[PDB]
């Protein structure tokens, strides 16, 4: 799996949008839903991937994202669980493809084949093809492009 740390743009394989959060949020300390984002309604939202021990931190507008009651949030408050992802490469999906999958509850990140813009992104045990490698939906699989910075 792994990936290299650094600043990347995340996309969803299912429509080609950027994931993260959006430029109008409440605020509050609540957790801010990871949506499948707007072309015109998506900047500021190149992640910070940051190794943790064995697995990875993935910050959205600085703050790390965790798993709750099967949605994917960025944490405000800083008491969410289970903040460590194992990102893995999936080449036979192409160069930059990726699953991400939660270090603790085994859970990864699915955008729904029929989300809509703004739609927050899930946390759900992955399916893939009995196939060798095995083939995943486009729901479970994001194009992490690695930018600069900012």
Known sequence: MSIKPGTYEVTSKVNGLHVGRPLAE??????????????????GNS???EKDDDAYILYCKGAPVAPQEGKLFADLLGNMEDKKWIVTHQPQHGENVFT???????????????????????????IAAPSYPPRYPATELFTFTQVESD
């Open 26 to 43: 409440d605020r509050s300390l609540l957790p801010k839903r990871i949506r499948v984002l707007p072309e015109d309604n998506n900047s």
């Open 47 to 49: 992640w910070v991937v």
């Open 100 to 126: 991400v999958v939660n270090a603790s509850t085994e859970h990864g990140w699915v955008v729904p084949a029929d989300a809509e813009e703004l739609q927050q992104v899930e946390v759900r045990p992955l």
